[PDB]
Scaffold this motif. Structure first.
Motif, short mmCIF file in Angstrom:
data_model
loop_
_atom_site.label_atom_id
_atom_site.label_comp_id
_atom_site.label_asym_id
_atom_site.label_seq_id
_atom_site.Cartn_x
_atom_site.Cartn_y
_atom_site.Cartn_z
N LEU A 3 -4.48 2.27 5.96
CA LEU A 3 -3.91 1.67 4.83
C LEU A 3 -4.61 0.60 3.61
CD1 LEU A 3 -1.16 0.63 7.24
CD2 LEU A 3 -0.62 1.36 4.99
N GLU A 4 -5.96 0.86 4.24
CA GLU A 4 -7.29 -0.45 3.65
C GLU A 4 -7.80 0.57 2.77
OE1 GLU A 4 -10.03 -2.00 5.72
OE2 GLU A 4 -10.64 -0.37 7.00
N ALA A 32 0.86 -1.31 -0.35
CA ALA A 32 -0.01 0.16 -0.64
C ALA A 32 0.74 1.00 -0.05
CB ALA A 32 -1.34 0.07 1.07
N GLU A 46 -6.34 3.37 1.27
CA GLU A 46 -5.34 3.41 -0.19
C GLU A 46 -6.13 2.31 -1.12
OE1 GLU A 46 -2.78 1.14 -1.26
OE2 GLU A 46 -2.50 2.36 -2.80
N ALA A 47 -5.99 0.96 -0.46
CA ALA A 47 -6.98 -0.16 -1.88
C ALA A 47 -7.41 0.74 -2.45
CB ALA A 47 -7.53 -1.19 -1.14
FE LIG Z 1 -4.28 -1.04 0.53
#
Ligand SMILES: [Fe+3]
Ligand SMILES: [Fe+3]
Ligand SMILES: [Fe+3]
Ligand SMILES: [Fe+3]
Ligand SMILES: [Fe+3]
Ligand SMILES: [Fe+3]
Ligand SMILES: [Fe+3]
Ligand SMILES: [Fe+3]
Lengths: 170, 170, 170, 170, 170, 170, 170, 170, 170, 170, 170, 170
Positions: free
Chosen positions: H34-35, F38, H37-38
Motif C-alpha cells: 500500500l505504501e 491507494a 503504491e504511493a
Molecule cells: Fe499509497
C-alpha cells in the motif's frame, strides 16, 4: 497555349505574392491603436494566404519547365503589382487604401491567367482559380472595412487557412 | 398542464428562432466598416445559437404530439417576436437597437415557458431554461455593446457553440 | 424529505437500470434479419445509456448514506420495472413491444423521483431529471419504430453517449 | 426576489471561492510524505474547481447589476466562509479537518442561494445548483478520506474539469 | 546569492500576479461599448497569463524553502506593484493607462529578479526570464493600443496560452 | 471439440464477469480512508475491464449457437466464481483478500478454456487468451498490494482500457 | 454577363435552399416505423447540406452587390422550387417522391446557373458547381431508395459534411 | 572552453542517465504494498525522464565531436553517479533514500556543467539547464516523500513528459 | 547595450532569414534524382524553420523601436550572409556546399548577437539563443550529409516544426 | 513445414481477397431500395476489410520468399474461392446468398492455413488467425441478415477498421 | 514447463534488447552521408522498438517470479546476442551486416522461447510471439537494404510504434 | 455528349486504376537496396492514390447508368493503359521507366476525358480534372527521379492522401 507567355505570367504572379508577404508584414505592424486593432488580424490572414499562394505557384512553374530567377532582387522586380509601400501618412484609412489597391491588382492578375488558360491548361486554370477565390475574398474584406460595402465574409478559422488553395499545398 | 397551450408557446418560440436565423443574416452583412467589425462576430454567434434553438425545440414539439405548420409562411407568421428588420437607417447603433430588442423579446418568451412549466413538465422546463441561459447571454452581449452596461461575457469558443443547449442537440 | 424513502426509490431505480443492461443484451441479439437491422443500433444505444444510468445512480445512493444490497440476486429482485424478457414469439414487433413497455416504466420511475424531490433535494432532482431526459428519448425511439408516431430524434453520435447524464459520469 | 440581497449572497460566495483558491494552494503544498501523497491530487482538483466557481459567478454578478469590490482586501473580507488556514499542527489529519469544514460551509452557501432563488431566478438557481453539485462532491471526497464514509466518487479526469459548471465557463 | 532576499522578491512578485488576476477581472468587465470590444480579449489574455505566472512562481518559492503568507490579506499587501484599481473615470483610455502602468511595473519586477540571479541561480533565472517574456509582450499589447507604437504582436491562440511559461506549469 | 461443453464454460465465464461488475462496485465504494485511496483506482480498472470481458464473451457465445439464460437470476447462479461479497469486517486488507481470491479464480477459468480449445477452436482460444492476459494482470495488481510480491505493472492509461481484449470490443 | 439576371438566379436558389431546410425537417419527422428508419438519416444528411448551400450562397450574393429581401416571406416566395410539402398520404413512398422531385429541381437550378456563368464568372461558376455536386448526390440517394437504380453512394461521414462546398463555408 | 573536458563531463552525465534507466526499473518493481503504491508512479516519471535525458545528451556529444564508448560496459563504468542499487533491506523508506541520493548527485552533475559552460557554450548550457530543471524537480518529489519538506509539485501529465527537455527531443 | 547597434544586427539577421527562404526554395527544387531525394526533405525542413526565424525576429525588432526597411530590395541588401545562389554546376555535392556555407554563416550571426546581449538584454539573448539552437542543428544536418561527420540528429517531426523558437511564434 | 505448399496457400488466399474487393464493389452497388439500404454498409465493411487482408498477406508472401504472379489475370485465376458474381436475379436475398457463400469459403481457407501452420510457423499462423477472426465476423453478419441466426455483432466503427489485422497493416 | 529455465531465457532476451538499445544508438550516428541517409530512420525504428521489447519483457519476468540482476554489468553480460559493435571499417555496408546479424540472432532467440512455451505458458508464448513479429520485420528491413531481397515492408508510422507488442506496453 | 462513349472511357480508366493497384504492389516490393529505398515510399503514395481513383470513378459510372463488367478478367482486359509489368531486368532504373510510362499514359487518359466533357458534363469534368491533378503529380515524381527534371513536389503527408480527389471519396 504559349507556354513561355504563361510562364512569364506565373512568375510575375509569384513575385507579387512573395513581395506582398514582406510588405504586408510592415503594414500589419503599423495597424496600431484602437481602430488598428480592428484590421490587424485581417491583414495577417491575407498575408499568410498570400505566402501560401507563392508556395502553390512554384511547383506549377517548375512543372511547366520554368524556373525562379537566380537573384531575389530580379525576382522582386518582376512583381505584377506595385509594391504595397507603407503610406507617407500611415493612418488606418491610408493603410486600407494600399491594401485594397494591392488586392484589386491581384484579382486582375489571376483573372488574366484564368482567361488565358480557360479550356487549354486545366491544371493551371484550376490553380489560378483557387488563388482567385482567395484574392476576391481578400478584396472583399478590405473593401468592407474601407468603403462599408456589405459583404458576407468572416475572419478565417485559423490565419493562413487558405481553404481554396490548400489542396495545392504540401 | 394544458398541452395544447404549451404546444402553441413552443411552436411560436420555434418560429421566432427560425426567422431570427434569417434576419440576423441580413443584419450581420450590414455590420460594416471599422465599428461594424466590432460586432460582426457577436451577431454571428447569436445567429448560429438561435439556429440551434430551433433545432432543439422541434424534437420536443413532436414528443408532445405537436407538429410544425404545413407551410413555411404560416410558420413565420407565428413568431412570438417581431421580425428583426434591417433599420431604414442601418447604422451600427440602429442595428444594435434591433438586436437588443429582439433578444429582450426572446428572454421574455422563454421566461414565460419556464413559468408555465415549472414543477409540471420537467423536460420542457429544462429545455426552456437551457435556451433562456443563451438568450440572457445574447441580451448581455448587445446591451454591453450598445449602452455600456458592464458584463462578464466573452465571445464563444467557436460560433454556435451553444454550451447550454448542446445536450439537446444531435 | 424522507431520506429512507428516497433511498428505496433510488436503489429500485438502479436495480432496473442494471437488469435492463442484461435483458437488452438478449433483445439486441435477437433483432435479426433485414427488419431487425433497423433496430439493432437503437437497442444498443439504449442499453449503453441505461448502463450509464446505473453508474450515475450509485454515487448518489452512497452520498445519501445508502448502500447496494449485499447479494446481486437481492438487487435484481428490487428492480422497479418488470424484467424485459425475450418474448415467447421473438418477432421484431414483439421485441419492440417489450422495449416500449420497459421504457415507459422507466419514464414513470424517474417522474416519481423528480416529483418527490422537486424543491427539496436539488442534486437528486437534477440527477433524476438528467436520466428522465434520456428515458423520454428512449421511449420516443421505440414508439416511433413501433407505432409510427412522428418524432424528431436521431441515433446518438456514439452509442452510450448519454448527453444529459454525462456530467454525472466519471 | 430582492436583487440587492441576492447580489450580496453571490458576492460573498465569490469571495469564498477566490480566497479558497489561495488557501488551498498552501494546504496542497503541506500535504507531504507518503500519506500526504494520497490527498495532494484531491486538494488540487478541488482548488481548480473552486477557481472555476469564481469565474462562473462573476458574469452573473455583473448581469444582475452588481460589481466586485474596488479593493481586493474588501473582497476577501466578504467571504461567506472562514479562511481555510493551515493548522497550527499541520498533520494530514488536521489538514483534512480544515478542508472538510471549508467544503461543508460551501455546501451551505449554495444551498442557501438555491433556496432563495428556487422558482424565481432560474438562471441564478441553475448556476447555484451547478456549483452545489461540485461542492457536494468536494465534501464527499474529503469526508471519505477523513472519516471513512463510503462514497462512489473518483478523481476527476483532468484537474479542474468542473463537469457541472463548465457550461457556464468561457 | 542571498536566498532570503531572493525569496522576498519572488513572494512579492507572486503577490502582484495574484492581485492582478483580481483587478484585471474588474477592468475587463468595464471595457464596454464598441471601443471596449477592441481590448476585452487582450485584457483577458493578460489576466489568464498572470494567473499562470502565480502558478509558476509558487513551486519555486517552496523549492527554495519559502512559503506563502498565512493570511491572504498579508499576501496582497506584499504585492510589488500598486493595485490596478478601476479609474475614477473608467473610460477605455483611462483603463489602458492603468493596464500599461501595471505591465511596466511587472517588467521591472522580473528584470530585477533576472539581474539578481544571472549566473547564480539558473533555475530561478530561467523562470524569471520566462515570465519576463510574457510581461514584455503584455506591455507591448497595451502600449500599441494606447500610444500607437508599432508592434509585431497578435492575440494569443487561446487565452492564457502562456507560450513561454507553460514548461513550468502543471 | 464438444461445443455444448464449450458453451457451458463460456456462459459460466460470462456470468462470473457480469456479477464481478456488480460486486466490485460495492468493494470500490468501501475502499475508504487514506489507505483505501491507494486501491480505489485499481479496483475501478479491474471492474471496467471485467465488464469489457462480459461484452467480449457474448458475441462468441452467440456465434457458437449458444444463448444467455432467459432470467438474470439464473445467469448469476451460473457464475464459475464465488460471489465477491463485501467482507463482514471490510478493512482494506480483507477487501484485498476478496479481490485476490476472485482474480485467481478468473485466471483458473480462462486457463481451463484455453486448455480445452488449444489447437481446436482458434477464435475461441484467442478470445480466452486475450481475457487471460487481463486476468493475470489483475491478479498481479492485487497480489502486489496485498503480499508485496514485486511486479512490473502500472495503472492503465484510462480505466477500462482493456489493451488485450479491445480488438474483440465494438 | 448580366449581373442583375445572375443575382436573381442566385437569390432564387438561396430561397429554395432556405425553405428546403424547413420542409425537410417536417419530412424527416414523418419518416417513421421500420421502413422510415431506412431513410431518416439520409433526409437529415440532405437537410443539413442544403442549409450549408444557403450559407455558401449568401456571401456570393453580397459580393456581387445583391441583397436578401427585407422580409422573410418575400424571400420564401422567391424559391425556384415548389415547396416540398408533406404529402396528404405521408407514406414512406410518397415522402420519397416529394424528396426526389425537390432534388431534381435543385439539380436543374444549379445546372442553369453553371450554364449561364461558364467561362464568364469563374467564382460563381465554381460555387454553382460545388453545390451541383451535392445536389446530384442527393438526387442519387433518393432515386436509389425509391426506384432501385444502382448507385455507388454511401451516407456521409457526419451529417452536413458537405465535402464539395465546405471550402466556401466559414 | 576546453572541449575535451566538456565532452568528458557530458559522456559521464549520459552514462549516469543510461544506468539510472536500468536501476530505477528495479527500484520501481520493488515499490510494493500500500505504501509502495504511493511512489511507483513517481519513480516511473523520473525513470522515463532520465531516459529522455540520455536521448537529449547524445546528439550534443556528437555535435561537439565526441562519441559514445565502443562497449556498453565501459560506458556504464563512466557514470558520474554511484549505481542506484536496490537496498539490502528494500523497504519503501530505504528505496526513497537511494532515489534521493541519486537525484542529488544528478543535480550536482548538471550544476557543474552549467557552471563550466555559462557564457561560453550557449547551446550546451541551455541543454544542461533544461536537464537541471527536471533533476531539481525529481529531487523535490523524493525529498517531499521522504522528509516531508513542502513542495509545490505534482505528478507529470503523462509519464516521461519532460516539459523542459522536450524541445531537444526528436 | 547600444540599442541602435543591436537593432542593426537583428535587422541584418532578419534579412538573411528572409532571403534564405527564397534561395532555399530554388536549391530544394534542384535536389533531383535518386541522390537528390536524400536531401530534399532536409532542405525543406531548414527552409521552413528559417522562415519561422524571420517571423520570430520581426516582433523583437519592433519591440526595441526598430523597423523593417521601406523597400524589400533595401531589406535584401542588408542580409548578413551571402546569397545562397544555385551553383553554376548544380550537382548535389555543390548544392550541399552552398547550404553548409549558408548555415555556418547563420551560426556565426546568432553567436555574435548572443555574445553582444549576454547578461544585458535577456529577452533578445533568449531569442537569439533559440534561433542559434536551430541553426546549429541545420549546420549539423548538412555537415553530416556532405562530409560524413557523425551526428545524432533526425528529420523533424513535421517540416517547419521549429521546436526551439516556437514559443516565440504566433 | 513445406514452404512451397504454404506459399501456394497464401497466394491463393491473397487472390481471393483481391478479387473479392472487385466483386463486392458490384454487389454493394446493387443493394438498392429500402431493403438494400439495410445491407449496403455491411457489404462495404466487408469489402474494405478484405482489401486490408490482401494488404496484410502480401508482405508475408515476400518474407517467405514467394512472389505475386507477373500478370493480374493469372493472379485472379488462382483465387481459392469462386468469383462472387452478381446473381442473374439480383434480389437482396440472392445477393446475400452470394455473400454468405463467399464468406464461408474464406473461413475455410484461413482455417486450412491455421491448421497447416499451427505450432510450426508462428508468424504465419498469427496472421492467418487474425484474418480468420474477421472472416468469421463477416460470415456472422451475413448469416444473421439472411437466415436470422442470432449474433452479437455490430457494424464496425469506421468501415475497414479491421480490428484484428490492423497490427499487420502499414 | 521449467520456470527457472524459462526465466533464464527471458532475462537473456531482455539483456539483448537493452544492450541493442545502446549499440544501435552508435550505429545510427554513424549512418552518415547520402547513402547513410537511406538507413538512419530504419535503424531508429528498430532501436526504439527494441527498447519497447525490453519494457515488455520486464513485467513478465517479475510475474514469473524472476528479477533483473542487481548490477547493470552482470545484466549486459547475460545478453543472448553478441554485442552489435560498430565495425572497424564503419561503411554503410559493414554497418548493415552488423544490423542483419543482430536481428537474425534476435529472431532465433524468440523462436526458441516460442518453441519452449507453445501449449504450456500461453501468456509468455503470446508475448514471445509479439516480439517475434517485430524481429522478423526488423530482419526483413535490413536484408532488403543489404542483399536486395524483395519485401513488402515500409517504414513504421511513427518510430517505435511497435504495432504487435504495444498491447503489452504501458 | 454521347453517354455510351463517355461510359466506355470511364470504365477503361477505372480498369487502368484497378490493375495499377495490383502491378504497383509488385513494383514496390522490388524497389530494394539502398537506391530502392529512395523510391519505395513514392511508389506506395502513387499506388494508394490510384486505388482512390478507382474508388472515385465507380460512383460516377453508376450515376451515368453504366456498370462494371461482370467478370474481373473482362474488367482487367479493358484497361486503357498497358500493364505495368515488372521488367525482365528489374533494376531501379528499369522500374522507374515502367512507372513513368504508366503515369504518362494515365495523364493522357484523363486529358482525353476532360477534353470530351469540357463544357458539357461538369460533374464528370471536375472528377476527371481532380484525378488529372494527381496523375500529373505522379508523373512529376517519377520524371524527377529518373531524368533529373526539376520539380517542386514533395512526398504526400500520409500515403494515399489524395488531396485533389478526396472530396469525391467516402
Ligand atoms: Fe499509497
Ligand atoms: Fe472594431
Ligand atoms: Fe432494416
Ligand atoms: Fe499515499
Ligand atoms: Fe493511499
Ligand atoms: Fe536517396
Ligand atoms: Fe433498410
Ligand atoms: Fe539516401
Amino acid at each position: 497555349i504559349d507556354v513561355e507567355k504563361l510562364l512569364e505570367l506565373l512568375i510575375k504572379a509569384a513575385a507579387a505574392e512573395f513581395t506582398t508577404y514582406y510588405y504586408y508584414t510592415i503594414l500589419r505592424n503599423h495597424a496600431t491603436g484602437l481602430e488598428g486593432e480592428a484590421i490587424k488580424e485581417i491583414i495577417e490572414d491575407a498575408r499568410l494566404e498570400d505566402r501560401n499562394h507563392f508556395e502553390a505557384l512554384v511547383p506549377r512553374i517548375y512543372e511547366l519547365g520554368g524556373e525562379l530567377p537566380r537573384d531575389i532582387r530580379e525576382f522582386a522586380d518582376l512583381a505584377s503589382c506595385r509594391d504595397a509601400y507603407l503610406p507617407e501618412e500611415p493612418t488606418i484609412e491610408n493603410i486600407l487604401k494600399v491594401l485594397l489597391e494591392a488586392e484589386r491588382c491581384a484579382v486582375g492578375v489571376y483573372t488574366e491567367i484564368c482567361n488565358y488558360t480557360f479550356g487549354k491548361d486545366p491544371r493551371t486554370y484550376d490553380l489560378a482559380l483557387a488563388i482567385l477565390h482567395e484574392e476576391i475574398e481578400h478584396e472583399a474584406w478590405f473593401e468592407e472595412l474601407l468603403t462599408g460595402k456589405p459583404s458576407g465574409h468572416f475572419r478565417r478559422g485559423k490565419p493562413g487557412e487558405s481553404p481554396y488553395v490548400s489542396k495545392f499545398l504540401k
